Amino acid sequence: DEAMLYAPVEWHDCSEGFEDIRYEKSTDGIAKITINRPQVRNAFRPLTVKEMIQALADARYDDNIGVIILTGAGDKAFCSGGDQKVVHHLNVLDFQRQIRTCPKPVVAMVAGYSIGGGHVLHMMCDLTIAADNAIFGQTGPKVGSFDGGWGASYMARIVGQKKAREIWFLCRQYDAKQALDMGLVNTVVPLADLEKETVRWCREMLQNSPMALRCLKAALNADCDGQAGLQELAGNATMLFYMTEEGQEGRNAFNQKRQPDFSKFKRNP
Amino acid sequence: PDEAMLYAPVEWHDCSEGFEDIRYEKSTDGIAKITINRPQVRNAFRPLTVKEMIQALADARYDDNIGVIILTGAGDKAFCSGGDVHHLNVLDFQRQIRTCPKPVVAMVAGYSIGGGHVLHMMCDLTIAADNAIFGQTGPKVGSFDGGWGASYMARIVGQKKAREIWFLCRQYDAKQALDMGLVNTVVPLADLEKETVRWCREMLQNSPMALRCLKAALNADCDGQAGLQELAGNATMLFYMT
Amino acid sequence: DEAMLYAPVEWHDCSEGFEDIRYEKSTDGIAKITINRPQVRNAFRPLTVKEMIQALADARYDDNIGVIILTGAGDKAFCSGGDVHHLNVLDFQRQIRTCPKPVVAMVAGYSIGGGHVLHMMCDLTIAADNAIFGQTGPKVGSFDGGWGASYMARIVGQKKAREIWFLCRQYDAKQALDMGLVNTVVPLADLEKETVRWCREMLQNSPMALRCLKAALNADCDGQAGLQELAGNATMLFYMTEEGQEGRNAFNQKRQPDFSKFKRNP
Amino acid sequence: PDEAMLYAPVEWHDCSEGFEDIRYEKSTDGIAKITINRPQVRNAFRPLTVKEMIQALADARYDDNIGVIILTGAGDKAFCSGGDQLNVLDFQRQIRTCPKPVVAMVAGYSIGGGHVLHMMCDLTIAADNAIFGQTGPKVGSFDGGWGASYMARIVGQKKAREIWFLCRQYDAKQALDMGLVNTVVPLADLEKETVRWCREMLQNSPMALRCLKAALNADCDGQAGLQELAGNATMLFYMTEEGQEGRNAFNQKRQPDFSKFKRNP
Amino acid sequence: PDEAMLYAPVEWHDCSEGFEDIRYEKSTDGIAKITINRPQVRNAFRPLTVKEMIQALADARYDDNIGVIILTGAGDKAFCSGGDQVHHLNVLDFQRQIRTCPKPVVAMVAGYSIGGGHVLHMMCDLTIAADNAIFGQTGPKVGSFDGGWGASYMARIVGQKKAREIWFLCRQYDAKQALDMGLVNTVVPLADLEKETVRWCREMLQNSPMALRCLKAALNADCDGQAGLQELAGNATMLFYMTEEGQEGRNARQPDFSKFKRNP
Amino acid sequence: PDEAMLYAPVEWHDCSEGFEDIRYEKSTDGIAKITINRPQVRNAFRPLTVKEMIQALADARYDDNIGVIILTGAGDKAFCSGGDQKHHLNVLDFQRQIRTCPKPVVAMVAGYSIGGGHVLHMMCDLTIAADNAIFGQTGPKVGSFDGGWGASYMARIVGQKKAREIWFLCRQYDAKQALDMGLVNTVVPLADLEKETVRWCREMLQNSPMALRCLKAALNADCDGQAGLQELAGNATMLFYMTEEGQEGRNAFNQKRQPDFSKFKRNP
Ligand SMILES: [Cl-]
Ligand SMILES: [Cl-]
Ligand SMILES: [Cl-]
Ligand SMILES: [Cl-]
Ligand SMILES: [Cl-]
Ligand SMILES: [Cl-]
């Protein structure tokens, strides 16, 4: 339904108190977090991370929000990573973990540079829609640092072990077509259409149930995150269980102050 | 502890029709019991025994009156002393025990040895008689179980003990098994079935969906994507329960 | 060479008593399981699953069969998903995984939803140019709770797997091939012809090496369950060695085994 | 070290301002204590309780004076009996990823959700009156998360299945024998021994402790554990000369030059 | 991109003394090159070849002037065609040694990389392939198999469907097919093989060697369970010793870590 | 088995030539013994020690007459008190080497097994402890740690609660505490340490060496991801070469014909 998918978008500002980001919510349930430091190619400082964390937590808790977009202000940079001129030092690890465990899809909308710490951010997002002017890569080894967490292992789950080793060991830059060919982004679109198409992808997700998306994200995370992934799966299993008769017999027994009785339930194969 | 209920007599009905090597019985309150019936060879299994255990366990899984399965051997001297369709069909039976959404309880008197030892380990719980004897024999007899018999064993008793069990192939008495965490409890032989049934009945009073989910969650810590498949299966069944 | 590989195939019917599928075997060792409900786009119901489980176990135990083909009747659909209990398909999926013989999905037209997970569980997928792939259904149950997801990510990678599940788009044969979902794409008219060639290439090779490698590749995904498969092959091999046989012979004749006769390899 | 040092009295300083369900206290030698303060309901948590615990634990993580955190319940009869009558999953992760040791100090009941919380703490010091168990399946609930798999890494697969499938209660001696708690002490000595254990860890390198905690989580938590462990490697690297060359070169308006560093074996 | 530096001539100093099956050479700017030198038998390895390769690689590892290693075959027709038709299976030790080597190892491939030879190139961190390169396994064809990193690790490179295809059918794949499935990092004209390989090597050589070893361990740790944890944590242990807090522990008089910040 | 056999005298033959920091000996019934010989420093290892141990273990591995290795310290007071604090971390190589050795490696511990020395006993497949044995880490006290197998693998031995205790507090534990937590396999009187150790080795030596290497790899595989699969699969490969179908490849090459697998049976 292209009319629906490409219908205009109505953004409402929710940036009060924020210095380094914009936070906006659409009427049809997309939240957008925008890194707003274009003069340093949207590099994050610890303050910027703090604000993103708060913005993301809000979006996670807002039942009107079904999908989150992460992006950079302007056309030239998504995020260039940590600010080199120096709310603590490595708080971006918290943010990474927050994106990871967020029960709603998070979409990186990338124009221009997604580099270093900013490249790991887009990879952490469930999906990435890249503009044709997008540029990708790591810089760690070039400037004597590294991300050996999800920035390494999860990257390898996206593009394979050979490419991951290439990306990190050389620290080259890769354009949008290259990113696309190695499986690094989901699609490449003309710069002028970047949000239009990103919003279309969001609305296609919004057609599916929130619970289904939550279960699917947890299952895919679970292939990577061991017991932390199992814990995500179980939380969803607990939520599902509460919505069934058998999972309500506990509470209903405690209402009528009687001992629970599970004898009336089928023992399925 | 409503022990009068827990310790009440059991109404067993026979379902052993067509089986040569095993007995298969069901109780009205939801226990199925699969008994290896070859006491002359200390309840060692052949491919036929295994084929029949697979049938009986598939029957118990599909009977919605059955909540818990008991695996055991005939008589007082042997749970199962190892292996004598095809040669290694016990591997199928291991998988089937593992993925059975119902608790499976090994009720062990005397020898649980070799292939027979792996079987009791595969069961969710083990209730042992004070005359129970445990251990592997593979390396002593030119064989080994490097599957769940190795790795899953380590998840029960720890890497040091697992290596001891496999490399030396000693026998271990009931107290030794208890102390290393190999079995869940030791009871006097005369009370073996009585306590086993009490344990089954305590589980039968609990949410069967809860047990099913928890068994898969605990398996998921070992079985990688096969474990995740179990969890996803449960999430689906939960959803179709609305 | 091409002469052998593209020779005519002689199918013998083994469909006796099956309502929802056809089951056939070639003289040269290929078994073919065909979902036979093209009137409903080859969607399966619990009976279809039960029959397929039966057919597969037959193929597994048939010492003349080396490779299994799974496919749908007609040209329009491989399998469009589900609607002998409600979720027995999950058992059939595991039986495919643990089958010590290669299983090949032969896909024409739709491979959708539960039907899409099916082709993915197969070791290889041969796709016709009219093939269409994708997941479906807004609700958890229509996703089977993401049953299939982790393994799909081992095929197409995490970004594309999240795309496939979260948006539920459809993909054509070229798109499937470019992301690694299928092994090759061939003209619809050449589908069986190419599939049989692929099967015949596998049939030329060591069946024991095939089962060991399949178990080995599964073991990267399936934790201890994979170790059980892989180790069970080692045990099967060990029994076929002299050191294995000395240990057994000693136990029978009730003596101590002399293993010193065998070298302690480094 | 010194037993006199280890068993010196402890001066708790109240930090509970704006908390309704919990008390939060700090000692001068570096211990934070979070007490569930609902003894009337056997220290069960309601969502407010969990919310305040998250806050306090966040505070403690950020207080450079704190090296070790104690989680406990008020009075002598209960540590935590689980949810009243899903932010607790958030609190569980927060305990897991806290770079400082977290010690469950258990008197009486640690039950249901309250049992998962003690297991999530790095160490458990149990009083002789302590009772442990799950209740989920008895009451139509279950924790298939860390409550299951991590439990199995503590007591083994046979015991974890028994605990979950039957939902019995276990006394302190039983918990100790299956490796569920670290030590059992007389109830009167519970805090005295716990503070001793905390002070022992406080004597050690905090960096070493956080690296080890991450290393141990990493045996359970796949790439999430790698993230914790690699995060620490990255932090350490910043404290080395080679790790500062990047930042130095930039501040010196020049190209990084790593040729000046050893290429170790 | 300083292509003058990157494409500058390279001078190999010979370190091959005492080697029968291989050549071992070093450049001044820090590249070690191990060349399988059995072109009579298409560069197939025997136990002695493996033993020498292990020696050469251990030398590269302990040479503080070496930052990257190139593994390659002599001549233009074969990188390595596999095992000859320490001990028999010693190639397994070489594979582990490539894996735990704290310096990048690059397979430079011309012509055949087949069988045990194909697993060799996969074990290397990167593979630069000539346009005449050919890849594939042969195990099932000749009744053997590599079920180790030869199977699982291949799957982390090309994906599960492709890995099953490669092993089950044992076809050969040309340079473009290898590139399209992510099996090699790049494909260049045969005449430029060493030129491009040296450029890639020089690019890594400009970067932090500590950073590279840490990321290599981190990437291995996604496959190798506790063995991966050992490498990763071993690097952490090494970094920790280089800090004041680590050094204070050594000097400790009982140690005092009170003067160090408890970071969040 | 026969206790007369198991407790027969043991005869150690010296193979220590060239070694400065260790002794290395072999018995004729197939046991190699590597003894850290620095008792004046409680058998602490320095890099030289580790290098010699690696060399000795490599020899034990390639010696077809050796089926089991004992790792031990000289005298009665120490197994190994850890890294000598007076290349740098070559002990990690030794750790991997103990791990991937296809023969059982048994730690024989009298007195202190501490720090890096405590990780060494854990790496061994089995540990036989004397009644005077003492165990524990020290890293955090002296500003260091082993977060590799020293942490994760210890957790597979004692469980996550005890592992955290051991590492976070760095206490010492006696032989009884060690046995109770599953850290050692058995505790024996000091005077019988070698006697019982040699008994255990001889029990293993009666079993199939192939079965033992396969099981060791299988048990490593529960911990070591693809590195463990490499070991396990490497054994499968070796087993395959000893079967007729596994020999067809080489027979076909020798007889100058294409391999033919049609003549072999398929199994379910
Ligand atoms: Cl970076
Ligand atoms: Cl056995
Ligand atoms: Cl509970
Ligand atoms: Cl091969
Ligand atoms: Cl993994
Ligand atoms: Cl230490």
PDB file of N, CA and C in Angstrom, chain D residues 61-62 64 66-67 99-100 202-208 210 215 218-219 223 226 229 233 235-237 239-240 242 258 262-265, chain E residues 61-64 66-67 102-103 205-211 213 221-222 226 229 232 236 238-240 242-243 245 257 261-264:
ATOM      1  N   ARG D  61      26.985   2.147  42.111  1.00  0.00           N
ATOM      2  CA  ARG D  61      27.874   1.937  40.979  1.00  0.00           C
ATOM      3  C   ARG D  61      28.667   3.208  40.691  1.00  0.00           C
ATOM      4  N   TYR D  62      28.009   4.356  40.802  1.00  0.00           N
ATOM      5  CA  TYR D  62      28.648   5.634  40.475  1.00  0.00           C
ATOM      6  C   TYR D  62      29.436   6.279  41.616  1.00  0.00           C
ATOM      7  N   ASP D  64      32.423   6.539  43.685  1.00  0.00           N
ATOM      8  CA  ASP D  64      33.813   6.075  43.710  1.00  0.00           C
ATOM      9  C   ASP D  64      34.306   5.637  45.089  1.00  0.00           C
ATOM     10  N   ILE D  66      32.462   3.650  47.001  1.00  0.00           N
ATOM     11  CA  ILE D  66      31.915   2.319  47.225  1.00  0.00           C
ATOM     12  C   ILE D  66      32.630   1.280  46.363  1.00  0.00           C
ATOM     13  N   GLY D  67      33.034   0.182  46.983  1.00  0.00           N
ATOM     14  CA  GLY D  67      33.657  -0.905  46.251  1.00  0.00           C
ATOM     15  C   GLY D  67      32.814  -2.163  46.236  1.00  0.00           C
ATOM     16  N   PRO D  99      30.059  -3.361  37.957  1.00  0.00           N
ATOM     17  CA  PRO D  99      31.492  -3.684  38.006  1.00  0.00           C
ATOM     18  C   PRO D  99      32.037  -3.861  39.421  1.00  0.00           C
ATOM     19  N   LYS D 100      31.160  -3.873  40.412  1.00  0.00           N
ATOM     20  CA  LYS D 100      31.574  -4.033  41.796  1.00  0.00           C
ATOM     21  C   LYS D 100      30.895  -5.290  42.341  1.00  0.00           C
ATOM     22  N   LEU D 202      37.407  -5.642  49.645  1.00  0.00           N
ATOM     23  CA  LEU D 202      37.797  -4.221  49.607  1.00  0.00           C
ATOM     24  C   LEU D 202      39.310  -4.031  49.666  1.00  0.00           C
ATOM     25  N   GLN D 203      39.998  -4.962  50.319  1.00  0.00           N
ATOM     26  CA  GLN D 203      41.455  -4.976  50.334  1.00  0.00           C
ATOM     27  C   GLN D 203      42.064  -5.262  48.961  1.00  0.00           C
ATOM     28  N   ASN D 204      41.283  -5.862  48.065  1.00  0.00           N
ATOM     29  CA  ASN D 204      41.831  -6.259  46.771  1.00  0.00           C
ATOM     30  C   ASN D 204      41.727  -5.154  45.727  1.00  0.00           C
ATOM     31  N   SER D 205      42.421  -5.329  44.614  1.00  0.00           N
ATOM     32  CA  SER D 205      42.321  -4.388  43.503  1.00  0.00           C
ATOM     33  C   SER D 205      40.908  -4.368  42.903  1.00  0.00           C
ATOM     34  N   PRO D 206      40.256  -3.203  42.926  1.00  0.00           N
ATOM     35  CA  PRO D 206      38.933  -3.034  42.309  1.00  0.00           C
ATOM     36  C   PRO D 206      38.939  -3.292  40.795  1.00  0.00           C
ATOM     37  N   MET D 207      40.020  -2.915  40.110  1.00  0.00           N
ATOM     38  CA  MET D 207      40.132  -3.213  38.689  1.00  0.00           C
ATOM     39  C   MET D 207      40.162  -4.731  38.460  1.00  0.00           C
ATOM     40  N   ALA D 208      40.948  -5.435  39.265  1.00  0.00           N
ATOM     41  CA  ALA D 208      41.038  -6.884  39.133  1.00  0.00           C
ATOM     42  C   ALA D 208      39.664  -7.538  39.354  1.00  0.00           C
ATOM     43  N   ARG D 210      36.648  -6.211  38.884  1.00  0.00           N
ATOM     44  CA  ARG D 210      35.695  -5.981  37.811  1.00  0.00           C
ATOM     45  C   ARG D 210      36.053  -6.790  36.566  1.00  0.00           C
ATOM     46  N   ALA D 215      34.811 -11.581  33.356  1.00  0.00           N
ATOM     47  CA  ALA D 215      35.331 -12.853  32.859  1.00  0.00           C
ATOM     48  C   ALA D 215      34.444 -14.032  33.243  1.00  0.00           C
ATOM     49  N   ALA D 218      31.197 -13.873  31.406  1.00  0.00           N
ATOM     50  CA  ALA D 218      31.433 -14.147  30.002  1.00  0.00           C
ATOM     51  C   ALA D 218      31.345 -15.642  29.674  1.00  0.00           C
ATOM     52  N   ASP D 219      31.480 -16.498  30.690  1.00  0.00           N
ATOM     53  CA  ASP D 219      31.233 -17.928  30.523  1.00  0.00           C
ATOM     54  C   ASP D 219      29.742 -18.228  30.350  1.00  0.00           C
ATOM     55  N   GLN D 223      28.092 -12.967  23.595  1.00  0.00           N
ATOM     56  CA  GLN D 223      28.659 -11.691  23.160  1.00  0.00           C
ATOM     57  C   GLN D 223      28.370 -10.548  24.145  1.00  0.00           C
ATOM     58  N   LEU D 226      31.275 -10.874  26.331  1.00  0.00           N
ATOM     59  CA  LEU D 226      32.385 -10.283  25.576  1.00  0.00           C
ATOM     60  C   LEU D 226      32.340  -8.755  25.625  1.00  0.00           C
ATOM     61  N   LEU D 229      33.702  -7.777  29.086  1.00  0.00           N
ATOM     62  CA  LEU D 229      35.127  -8.102  29.165  1.00  0.00           C
ATOM     63  C   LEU D 229      35.949  -7.205  28.239  1.00  0.00           C
ATOM     64  N   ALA D 233      39.002  -4.295  28.797  1.00  0.00           N
ATOM     65  CA  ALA D 233      40.258  -4.269  28.049  1.00  0.00           C
ATOM     66  C   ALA D 233      40.467  -2.883  27.457  1.00  0.00           C
ATOM     67  N   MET D 235      39.254  -0.057  28.512  1.00  0.00           N
ATOM     68  CA  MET D 235      39.540   0.889  29.582  1.00  0.00           C
ATOM     69  C   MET D 235      41.002   0.801  30.010  1.00  0.00           C
ATOM     70  N   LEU D 236      41.510  -0.424  30.137  1.00  0.00           N
ATOM     71  CA  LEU D 236      42.901  -0.651  30.521  1.00  0.00           C
ATOM     72  C   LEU D 236      43.853  -0.069  29.478  1.00  0.00           C
ATOM     73  N   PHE D 237      43.539  -0.313  28.216  1.00  0.00           N
ATOM     74  CA  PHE D 237      44.340   0.164  27.101  1.00  0.00           C
ATOM     75  C   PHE D 237      44.526   1.680  27.154  1.00  0.00           C
ATOM     76  N   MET D 239      44.838   3.413  29.726  1.00  0.00           N
ATOM     77  CA  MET D 239      45.825   3.673  30.771  1.00  0.00           C
ATOM     78  C   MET D 239      47.249   3.242  30.397  1.00  0.00           C
ATOM     79  N   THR D 240      47.491   2.936  29.127  1.00  0.00           N
ATOM     80  CA  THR D 240      48.835   2.574  28.697  1.00  0.00           C
ATOM     81  C   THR D 240      49.343   3.638  27.743  1.00  0.00           C
ATOM     82  N   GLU D 242      50.860   3.221  24.715  1.00  0.00           N
ATOM     83  CA  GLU D 242      50.387   2.959  23.355  1.00  0.00           C
ATOM     84  C   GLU D 242      48.939   3.422  23.198  1.00  0.00           C
ATOM     85  N   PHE D 258      52.739   4.381  15.865  1.00  0.00           N
ATOM     86  CA  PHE D 258      52.789   3.214  16.725  1.00  0.00           C
ATOM     87  C   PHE D 258      54.043   2.397  16.472  1.00  0.00           C
ATOM     88  N   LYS D 262      56.407  -1.974  21.149  1.00  0.00           N
ATOM     89  CA  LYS D 262      56.770  -3.383  20.992  1.00  0.00           C
ATOM     90  C   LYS D 262      55.694  -4.225  20.301  1.00  0.00           C
ATOM     91  N   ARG D 263      56.115  -5.126  19.420  1.00  0.00           N
ATOM     92  CA  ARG D 263      55.186  -6.071  18.817  1.00  0.00           C
ATOM     93  C   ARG D 263      55.316  -7.430  19.495  1.00  0.00           C
ATOM     94  N   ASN D 264      54.808  -7.481  20.721  1.00  0.00           N
ATOM     95  CA  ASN D 264      54.928  -8.630  21.607  1.00  0.00           C
ATOM     96  C   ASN D 264      54.485  -9.987  21.045  1.00  0.00           C
ATOM     97  N   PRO D 265      55.023 -11.071  21.628  1.00  0.00           N
ATOM     98  CA  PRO D 265      54.610 -12.425  21.249  1.00  0.00           C
ATOM     99  C   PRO D 265      53.319 -12.826  21.960  1.00  0.00           C
TER     100      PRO D 265
ATOM    101  N   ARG E  61      56.317 -14.802  15.269  1.00  0.00           N
ATOM    102  CA  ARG E  61      55.613 -14.395  16.471  1.00  0.00           C
ATOM    103  C   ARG E  61      56.546 -13.733  17.481  1.00  0.00           C
ATOM    104  N   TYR E  62      57.704 -14.340  17.701  1.00  0.00           N
ATOM    105  CA  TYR E  62      58.645 -13.831  18.687  1.00  0.00           C
ATOM    106  C   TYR E  62      59.573 -12.744  18.164  1.00  0.00           C
ATOM    107  N   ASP E  63      59.514 -12.468  16.864  1.00  0.00           N
ATOM    108  CA  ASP E  63      60.338 -11.413  16.283  1.00  0.00           C
ATOM    109  C   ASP E  63      59.642 -10.071  16.489  1.00  0.00           C
ATOM    110  N   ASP E  64      60.165  -9.255  17.400  1.00  0.00           N
ATOM    111  CA  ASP E  64      59.528  -7.987  17.742  1.00  0.00           C
ATOM    112  C   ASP E  64      59.504  -6.963  16.593  1.00  0.00           C
ATOM    113  N   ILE E  66      58.619  -8.018  13.499  1.00  0.00           N
ATOM    114  CA  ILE E  66      57.565  -8.502  12.605  1.00  0.00           C
ATOM    115  C   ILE E  66      56.187  -8.103  13.131  1.00  0.00           C
ATOM    116  N   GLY E  67      55.405  -7.414  12.303  1.00  0.00           N
ATOM    117  CA  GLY E  67      54.037  -7.072  12.654  1.00  0.00           C
ATOM    118  C   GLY E  67      52.938  -7.855  11.920  1.00  0.00           C
ATOM    119  N   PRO E 102      49.212 -13.582  17.725  1.00  0.00           N
ATOM    120  CA  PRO E 102      48.760 -12.221  18.039  1.00  0.00           C
ATOM    121  C   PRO E 102      49.042 -11.196  16.932  1.00  0.00           C
ATOM    122  N   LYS E 103      49.438 -11.656  15.753  1.00  0.00           N
ATOM    123  CA  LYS E 103      49.727 -10.763  14.634  1.00  0.00           C
ATOM    124  C   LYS E 103      48.898 -11.245  13.462  1.00  0.00           C
ATOM    125  N   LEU E 205      50.233  -2.434   9.318  1.00  0.00           N
ATOM    126  CA  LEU E 205      51.479  -2.092  10.000  1.00  0.00           C
ATOM    127  C   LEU E 205      51.509  -0.641  10.509  1.00  0.00           C
ATOM    128  N   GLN E 206      50.650   0.212   9.966  1.00  0.00           N
ATOM    129  CA  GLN E 206      50.584   1.602  10.398  1.00  0.00           C
ATOM    130  C   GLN E 206      49.722   1.743  11.650  1.00  0.00           C
ATOM    131  N   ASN E 207      49.022   0.672  12.000  1.00  0.00           N
ATOM    132  CA  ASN E 207      48.065   0.719  13.101  1.00  0.00           C
ATOM    133  C   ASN E 207      48.629   0.155  14.406  1.00  0.00           C
ATOM    134  N   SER E 208      47.919   0.387  15.507  1.00  0.00           N
ATOM    135  CA  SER E 208      48.321  -0.137  16.807  1.00  0.00           C
ATOM    136  C   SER E 208      48.395  -1.667  16.844  1.00  0.00           C
ATOM    137  N   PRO E 209      49.599  -2.215  17.054  1.00  0.00           N
ATOM    138  CA  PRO E 209      49.766  -3.666  17.205  1.00  0.00           C
ATOM    139  C   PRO E 209      49.020  -4.203  18.427  1.00  0.00           C
ATOM    140  N   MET E 210      48.900  -3.411  19.487  1.00  0.00           N
ATOM    141  CA  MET E 210      48.135  -3.873  20.639  1.00  0.00           C
ATOM    142  C   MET E 210      46.658  -3.929  20.268  1.00  0.00           C
ATOM    143  N   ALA E 211      46.187  -2.908  19.558  1.00  0.00           N
ATOM    144  CA  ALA E 211      44.790  -2.894  19.118  1.00  0.00           C
ATOM    145  C   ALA E 211      44.469  -4.103  18.223  1.00  0.00           C
ATOM    146  N   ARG E 213      45.981  -7.078  18.065  1.00  0.00           N
ATOM    147  CA  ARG E 213      45.993  -8.353  18.755  1.00  0.00           C
ATOM    148  C   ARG E 213      44.746  -8.517  19.618  1.00  0.00           C
ATOM    149  N   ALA E 221      37.094 -14.914  19.832  1.00  0.00           N
ATOM    150  CA  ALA E 221      36.322 -15.275  21.017  1.00  0.00           C
ATOM    151  C   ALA E 221      34.847 -15.465  20.677  1.00  0.00           C
ATOM    152  N   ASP E 222      34.439 -15.005  19.495  1.00  0.00           N
ATOM    153  CA  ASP E 222      33.071 -15.269  19.030  1.00  0.00           C
ATOM    154  C   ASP E 222      32.903 -16.721  18.557  1.00  0.00           C
ATOM    155  N   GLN E 226      35.700 -20.891  25.798  1.00  0.00           N
ATOM    156  CA  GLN E 226      36.680 -20.500  26.816  1.00  0.00           C
ATOM    157  C   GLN E 226      38.100 -20.298  26.261  1.00  0.00           C
ATOM    158  N   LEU E 229      38.139 -16.956  25.311  1.00  0.00           N
ATOM    159  CA  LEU E 229      38.208 -16.150  26.537  1.00  0.00           C
ATOM    160  C   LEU E 229      39.638 -16.109  27.065  1.00  0.00           C
ATOM    161  N   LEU E 232      41.546 -13.469  24.942  1.00  0.00           N
ATOM    162  CA  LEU E 232      41.042 -12.129  25.238  1.00  0.00           C
ATOM    163  C   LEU E 232      41.479 -11.680  26.625  1.00  0.00           C
ATOM    164  N   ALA E 236      44.063  -8.777  28.367  1.00  0.00           N
ATOM    165  CA  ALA E 236      43.645  -7.875  29.433  1.00  0.00           C
ATOM    166  C   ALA E 236      44.659  -7.940  30.559  1.00  0.00           C
ATOM    167  N   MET E 238      47.717  -8.657  30.262  1.00  0.00           N
ATOM    168  CA  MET E 238      48.922  -7.973  29.779  1.00  0.00           C
ATOM    169  C   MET E 238      48.792  -6.447  29.827  1.00  0.00           C
ATOM    170  N   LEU E 239      47.612  -5.929  29.501  1.00  0.00           N
ATOM    171  CA  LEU E 239      47.389  -4.488  29.579  1.00  0.00           C
ATOM    172  C   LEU E 239      47.413  -4.022  31.038  1.00  0.00           C
ATOM    173  N   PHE E 240      46.840  -4.846  31.919  1.00  0.00           N
ATOM    174  CA  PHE E 240      46.694  -4.523  33.340  1.00  0.00           C
ATOM    175  C   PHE E 240      48.041  -4.363  34.027  1.00  0.00           C
ATOM    176  N   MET E 242      50.565  -3.205  32.698  1.00  0.00           N
ATOM    177  CA  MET E 242      51.145  -1.945  32.221  1.00  0.00           C
ATOM    178  C   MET E 242      50.514  -0.706  32.863  1.00  0.00           C
ATOM    179  N   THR E 243      49.656  -0.914  33.852  1.00  0.00           N
ATOM    180  CA  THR E 243      48.990   0.199  34.513  1.00  0.00           C
ATOM    181  C   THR E 243      49.548   0.393  35.924  1.00  0.00           C
ATOM    182  N   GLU E 245      47.824   0.692  38.793  1.00  0.00           N
ATOM    183  CA  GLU E 245      47.146  -0.245  39.701  1.00  0.00           C
ATOM    184  C   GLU E 245      47.704  -1.680  39.624  1.00  0.00           C
ATOM    185  N   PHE E 257      45.390  -0.364  47.207  1.00  0.00           N
ATOM    186  CA  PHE E 257      44.639   0.034  46.015  1.00  0.00           C
ATOM    187  C   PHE E 257      43.628   1.128  46.335  1.00  0.00           C
ATOM    188  N   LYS E 261      40.809   4.930  41.634  1.00  0.00           N
ATOM    189  CA  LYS E 261      39.382   5.200  41.494  1.00  0.00           C
ATOM    190  C   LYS E 261      38.606   3.932  41.154  1.00  0.00           C
ATOM    191  N   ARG E 262      37.479   3.733  41.834  1.00  0.00           N
ATOM    192  CA  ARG E 262      36.538   2.677  41.471  1.00  0.00           C
ATOM    193  C   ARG E 262      35.616   3.202  40.381  1.00  0.00           C
ATOM    194  N   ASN E 263      35.987   2.954  39.128  1.00  0.00           N
ATOM    195  CA  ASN E 263      35.216   3.444  37.992  1.00  0.00           C
ATOM    196  C   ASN E 263      33.827   2.818  37.910  1.00  0.00           C
ATOM    197  N   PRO E 264      32.874   3.541  37.299  1.00  0.00           N
ATOM    198  CA  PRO E 264      31.532   3.008  37.061  1.00  0.00           C
ATOM    199  C   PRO E 264      31.500   2.114  35.829  1.00  0.00           C
TER     200      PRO E 264
END
